[PDB]
Amino acid sequence: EKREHEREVIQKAIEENNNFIKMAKEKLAQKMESNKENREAHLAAMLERLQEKDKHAEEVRKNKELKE
Amino acid sequence: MRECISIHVGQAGVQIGNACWELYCLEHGIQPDGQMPSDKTIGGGDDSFNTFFSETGAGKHVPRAVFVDLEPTVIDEVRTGTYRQLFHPEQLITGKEDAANNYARGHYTIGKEIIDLVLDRIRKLADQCTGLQGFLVFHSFGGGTGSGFTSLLMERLSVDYGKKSKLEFSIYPAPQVSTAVVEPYNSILTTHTTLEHSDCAFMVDNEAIYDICRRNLDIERPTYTNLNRLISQIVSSITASLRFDGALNVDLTEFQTNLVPYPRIHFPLATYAPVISAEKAYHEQLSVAEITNACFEPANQMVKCDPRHGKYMACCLLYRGDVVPKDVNAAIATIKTKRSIQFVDWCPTGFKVGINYQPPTVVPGGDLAKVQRAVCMLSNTTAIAEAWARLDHKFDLMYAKRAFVHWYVGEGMEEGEFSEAREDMAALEKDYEEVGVDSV
Amino acid sequence: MREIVHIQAGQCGNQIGAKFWEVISDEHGIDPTGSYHGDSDLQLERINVYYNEATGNKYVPRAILVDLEPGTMDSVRSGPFGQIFRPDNFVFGQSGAGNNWAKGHYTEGAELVDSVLDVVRKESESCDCLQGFQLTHSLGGGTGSGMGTLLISKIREEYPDRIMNTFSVMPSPKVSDTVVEPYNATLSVHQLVENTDETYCIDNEALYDICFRTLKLTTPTYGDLNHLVSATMSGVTTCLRFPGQLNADLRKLAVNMVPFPRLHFFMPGFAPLTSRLTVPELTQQMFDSKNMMAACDPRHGRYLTVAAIFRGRMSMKEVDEQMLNVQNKNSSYFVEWIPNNVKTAVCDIPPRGLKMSATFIGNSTAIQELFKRISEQFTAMFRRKAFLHWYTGEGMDEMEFTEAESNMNDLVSEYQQYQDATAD
Ligand SMILES: CC[C@H](C)[C@H](NC(=O)[C@H]1CCCCN1C)C(=O)N(CCCCC(C)C)[C@H](C[C@@H](O)c1nc(C(=O)N[C@@H](Cc2ccc(F)cc2)C[C@H](C)C(=O)O)cs1)C(C)C
Ligand SMILES: Nc1nc2c(ncn2[C@@H]2O[C@H](COP(=O)(O)OP(=O)(O)OP(=O)(O)O)[C@@H](O)[C@H]2O)c(=O)[nH]1
Ligand SMILES: Nc1nc2c(ncn2[C@@H]2O[C@H](COP(=O)(O)OP(=O)(O)O)[C@@H](O)[C@H]2O)c(=O)[nH]1
Ligand SMILES: [Ca+2]
Ligand SMILES: [Mg+2]
Numbered sequence: 001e002k003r004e005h006e007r008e009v010i011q012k013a014i015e016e017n018n019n020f021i022k023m024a025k026e027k028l029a030q031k032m033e034s035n036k037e038n039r040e041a042h043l044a045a046m047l048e049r050l051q052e053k054d055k056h057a058e059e060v061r062k063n064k065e066l067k068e
Numbered sequence: 069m070r071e072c073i074s075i076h077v078g079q080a081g082v083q084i085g086n087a088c089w090e091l092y093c094l095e096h097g098i099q100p101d102g103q104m105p106s107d108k109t110i111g112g113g114d115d116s117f118n119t120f121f122s123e124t125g126a127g128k129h130v131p132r133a134v135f136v137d138l139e140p141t142v143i144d145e146v147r148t149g150t151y152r153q154l155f156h157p158e159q160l161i162t163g164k165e166d167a168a169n170n171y172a173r174g175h176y177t178i179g180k181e182i183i184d185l186v187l188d189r190i191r192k193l194a195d196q197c198t199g200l201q202g203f204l205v206f207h208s209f210g211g212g213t214g215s216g217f218t219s220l221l222m223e224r225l226s227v228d229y230g231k232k233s234k235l236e237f238s239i240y241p242a243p244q245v246s247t248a249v250v251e252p253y254n255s256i257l258t259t260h261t262t263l264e265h266s267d268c269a270f271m272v273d274n275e276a277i278y279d280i281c282r283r284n285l286d287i288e289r290p291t292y293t294n295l296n297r298l299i300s301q302i303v304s305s306i307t308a309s310l311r312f313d314g315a316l317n318v319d320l321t322e323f324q325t326n327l328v329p330y331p332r333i334h335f336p337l338a339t340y341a342p343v344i345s346a347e348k349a350y351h352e353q354l355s356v357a358e359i360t361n362a363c364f365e366p367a368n369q370m371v372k373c374d375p376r377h378g379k380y381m382a383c384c385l386l387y388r389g390d391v392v393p394k395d396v397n398a399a400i401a402t403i404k405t406k407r408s409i410q411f412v413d414w415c416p417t418g419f420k421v422g423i424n425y426q427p428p429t430v431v432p433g434g435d436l437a438k439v440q441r442a443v444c445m446l447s448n449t450t451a452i453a454e455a456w457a458r459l460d461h462k463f464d465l466m467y468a469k470r471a472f473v474h475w476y477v478g479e480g481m482e483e484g485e486f487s488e489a490r491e492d493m494a495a496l497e498k499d500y501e502e503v504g505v506d507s508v
Numbered sequence: 509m510r511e512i513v514h515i516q517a518g519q520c521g522n523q524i525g526a527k528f529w530e531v532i533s534d535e536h537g538i539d540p541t542g543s544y545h546g547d548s549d550l551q552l553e554r555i556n557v558y559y560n561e562a563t564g565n566k567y568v569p570r571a572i573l574v575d576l577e578p579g580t581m582d583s584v585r586s587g588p589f590g591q592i593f594r595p596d597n598f599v600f601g602q603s604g605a606g607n608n609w610a611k612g613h614y615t616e617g618a619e620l621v622d623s624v625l626d627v628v629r630k631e632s633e634s635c636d637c638l639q640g641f642q643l644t645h646s647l648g649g650g651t652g653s654g655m656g657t658l659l660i661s662k663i664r665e666e667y668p669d670r671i672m673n674t675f676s677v678m679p680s681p682k683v684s685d686t687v688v689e690p691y692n693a694t695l696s697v698h699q700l701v702e703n704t705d706e707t708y709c710i711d712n713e714a715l716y717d718i719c720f721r722t723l724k725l726t727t728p729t730y731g732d733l734n735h736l737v738s739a740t741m742s743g744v745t746t747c748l749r750f751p752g753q754l755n756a757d758l759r760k761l762a763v764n765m766v767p768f769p770r771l772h773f774f775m776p777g778f779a780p781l782t783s784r785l786t787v788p789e790l791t792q793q794m795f796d797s798k799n800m801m802a803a804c805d806p807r808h809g810r811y812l813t814v815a816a817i818f819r820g821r822m823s824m825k826e827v828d829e830q831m832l833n834v835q836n837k838n839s840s841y842f843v844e845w846i847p848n849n850v851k852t853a854v855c856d857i858p859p860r861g862l863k864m865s866a867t868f869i870g871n872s873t874a875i876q877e878l879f880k881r882i883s884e885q886f887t888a889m890f891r892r893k894a895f896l897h898w899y900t901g902e903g904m905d906e907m908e909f910t911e912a913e914s915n916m917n918d919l920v921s922e923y924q925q926y927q928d929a930t931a932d
Contacts, residue, residue, distance in 0.1 A: 017230055017231055020226070020231070021226065021227055021230060024223060024226045024227050024264075024265070025227045027223075028223050028224070028227070032176065032180065034480075034482075035176045035479075035480035035481065036176075036480065038480040038481070038482065039176070039177070039478075039479060039480035042477075042478055042480070043668060043669075046664075046668055047665065047668060050661060050664060050665050053661055057613075057614060057618065059903075060610075060614045060902070060903035060904055061614060061615065061618070061903060062903070063903035063905075064614075064615065064901075064902055064903035067901070067903075164636070164637045165637055166757075168757070168759040168760050168763055169760055169763050169764075170763060243848045244828070246848060246851075247753050247754050247755075247760075247764075247851070248760075248763065248764060249763075249764050249767075249813065249846060249847075249848060249849055249851075250763060250764075251848075252847070288823075288824075288825050289823075289824040289825040289828065462847045462848075465844070465845045465846070465847055465931060466767075466845065466846055466847070468845065468931075469767075469845055469926070469929060470768075471767040471768070471812075471845070471846055472763070472766075472767050474768065474769045475763055475766075
């Protein structure tokens with residue numbers, strides 16, 4: 001029974017070390033994915049707002065040519 | 069064997085890096101070209117200095133070190149400086165555009181473009197090791213690379229190296245030399261992210277080193293060069309255990325056992341003595357009792373806090389030079405008799421001691437006197453929490469208004485990471501309070 | 509290296525632009541031919557920031573010269589320093605501007621705009637590591653204001669992750685009789701609050717009052733005003749141009765100076781004021797209303813952030829003591845909820861004619877006084893529709909004036925919000 005317990009201890013040590021590596025790897029994967037999509041969302045909104053300025057700037061130039 | 073790989077991240081880490089290696093070369097009799105005349109085993113060996121230096125067949129002794137910065141200026145000075153021959157070019161890694169004092173750019177935006185390259189070069193050093201002990205990480209809390217890139221690196225090292233030991237030397241920010249209003253944000257973010265990944269971290273308060281330079285070395289307005297030479301001595305005393313051998317040398321891992329009662333309580337306070345000018349050290353022999361007693365004066369600490377208003381959970385004393393056991397035993401017995409040091413009730417009142425006989429060295433044209441003997445005390449005291457408290461307060465002041473947060477949100481971070489990081493620091497401050505309460 | 513790309517637009521923009529290049533060229537030891545004749549390696553170390561390197565060891569400003577009038581760009585070529593600029597960087601119009609923002613932003617400016625971008629694109633593409641862009645202009649005219657802010661917007665599309673920096677000259681009735689400038693300025697601030705990272709507020713009301721009251725010039729010229737603008741511009745770009753730790757690039761400066769993204773309008777200052785001191789005096793003069801290039805009393809608000817650059821051979825211990833002194837004695841005027849919000853740099857190399865000098869860069873809530881002044885003038889004519897046909901004629905709606913007014917007054921509210929906030 002003492003030999004089975006010695007085995008169980010060394011397996012627990014290996015398993016906890018492996019679980020720590022695993023969670024570090026998952027937590028880091030979800031952080032970097034979350035950051036990428038957040039940053040792309042912020043630049044998309046920046047340029048989609050700058051493109052609304054281009055639509056408005058052509059409405060101003062076409063409104064001029066509707067005073068002819 | 070028991071090799072250590074040193075990693076120097078960002079300006080602070082790199083420049084403290086230069087001072088440390090320069091100092092190690094002078095201590096081991098290694099020249100700026102890497103040749104070491106006193107070493108008769110050419111090509112390799114397992115002498116104590118081989119924990120920090122590998123060896124080429126050509127007789128060159130090469131630091132087991134990677135230097136990383138997201139910006140080429142500081143490392144370019146290493147690449148063309150006095151010690152350029154010491155390092156292989158692959159050990160000196162640089163990007164183009166820095167992290168702009170933003171944790172988010174160091175960890176996510178800019179940092180991710182160079183992280184796989186850095187692990188590659190670290191792996192090349194690891195594959196040269198017969199029995200890798202672990203890593204020493206040098207970095208600022210305040211900078212964007214020092215905070216953000218170091219965090220990323222630490223997370224990745226835990227994945228790629230399991231539980232190999234990882235020690236930090238972390239530069240804690242001071243108003244006298246700071247270059248960023250957001251340093252408190254970066255300090256809290258990196259401390260939170262790194263806490264689970266670091267086995268032992270030595271904080272170096274720049275304000276403390278600044279004061280020691282002013283007060284003890286008569287330096288008017290200290291520069292990084294001044295600060296760094298003194299930091300190097302303290303780092304040298306801590307690593308001395310690994311780099312030398314001797315009958316009374318206690319290894320850094322043994323001090324670690326006494327210093328870390330619980331995994332999160334891994335921030336030892338370092339105190340160093342004597343820090344004295346050549347002019348004052350003339351016709352003045354400072355005894356073992358004198359320098360030991362100087363470890364309990366808070367003016368000589370690496371972090372500004374007061375251990376006399378806290379409780380010790382460990383006390384380790386790392387002597388170097390002309391020091392013999394009789395003198396050390398007598399000095400520590402005086403500390404006991406006089407008291408002035410309360411331990412928590414759950415901790416034995418021990419003083420774990422080591423001695424290396426090689427005396428302290430100084431760099432040419434430095435401020436420090438060459439003394440016969442020196443000591444670095446490493447203590448675990450509840451008072452170190454004061455450093456977190458000061459920083460956590462500055463964090464709160466700005467974060468209640470969300471001041472500067474848009475710079476972090478703009479690089480992909482959420483407010484959730486800030487408040488999560490601050491909760492972990494609140495929990496850390498409570499841990500240092502809890503361990504200091506007496507048992508029922 | 510960290511390259512900046514300079515743009516000067518309109519009459520005012522090209523005057524202060526030209527004089528900026530005179531002053532910093534003298535400092536780096538560059539003569540009008542573009543050759544180095546100096547004595548110090550520190551002059552060249554960060555020369556790539558503003559100058560391209562050419563064949564035959566020469567140095568060319570990374571500068572793009574723009575205006576809708578062809579005349580001002582002849583006068584740039586004329587006055588020595590002028591044969592230094594790159595000939596194909598000169599992008600000129602024909603019609604001229606007419607102090608009409610709509611013309612500069614929508615019609616006449618839009619036609620010329622792509623010719624400017626092509627030059628910007630050529631300069632930007634051979635940069636090793638581009639920091640971003642520096643525009644000099646006035647907000648009272650038509651080209652510098654309307655086409656300048658169009659330029660800014662069009663450069664953000666193609667370089668969204670670079671820094672956009674402006675030196676924006678604000679209109680004063682004391683300097684210009686043009687009635688329509690409150691409209692031009694308000695419309696320009698509407699653009700700047702959204703599309704720039706950091707804007708230095710060069711205020712002609714402040715510049716005239718320094719020249720008339722302090723300097724005692726009974727009839728001040730544009731050249732008298734621009735001597736003050738060029739002193740400021742040398743001063744606030746010192747950290748970008750020489751080696752150092754503090755605010756050494758445009759992004760690091762922004763991160764130290766801009767706590768909230770809309771609040772990026774700085775209030776520069778300078779001592780000594782001159783025409784053509786000890787560290788305690790320099791330090792006192794910096795935080796005093798008389799020395800500010802915006803017409804705002806800093807003791808009517810609080811400073812969110814501050815940068816202080818001291819130039820000359822002085823004691824760094826003395827500078828540290830005085831900057832601590834000034835914060836202790838003026839603590840109320842620094843927001844308590846941003847700790848360590850005053851940063852200090854010291855540069856050994858002084859400017860021309862002085863042996864020591866100080867430059868000040870303040871993000872002050874008192875800057876609202878500038879925007880209120882402009883907003884009172886704007887609304888004085890907008891409540892009775894005066895001269896709107898100039899703008900409606902080019903196709904603008906009456907609602908774009910309302911939206912511009914409303915955003916500038918929001919900006920005033922936001923300055924007041926953070927002025928009144930506390931640590932509690
Ligand atoms: C009564 C006319 C004078 C000349 C005018 N004052 C006013 O308009 C007053 C009176 C009514 C109440 C309020 N206004 C502002 C004036 O003194 N001005 C404005 C000029 C308006 C120009 C017209 C065409 C709209 C001053 C500028 C004027 O004196 C000039 N300075 C220069 C000038 O600086 N020339 C330099 C070169 C230069 C040329 C053109 C530039 F745009 C800039 C520099 C060289 C000279 C030698 C120097 O170094 O000072 C050219 S014209 C202001 C600073 C108040
Ligand atoms: N002791 C010491 N501190 C330094 C040194 N260089 C910078 N610091 C401190 O480190 C912090 C600034 O961070 P840096 O290390 O310069 O920044 P970085 O890691 O290069 O990050 P980025 O520049 O943002 O990419 C401030 O608190 C400085 O006071 C140094 O050589 N020695
Ligand atoms: N400080 C200063 N202000 C100027 C200068 N030239 C014009 N201004 C001001 O700029 C505004 C008109 O802008 P201007 O550059 O002439 O218009 P543009 O033709 O559209 O570029 C007015 O408020 C003038 O007082 C100058 O050289 N220095
Ligand atoms: Ca050997
Ligand atoms: Mg850096």
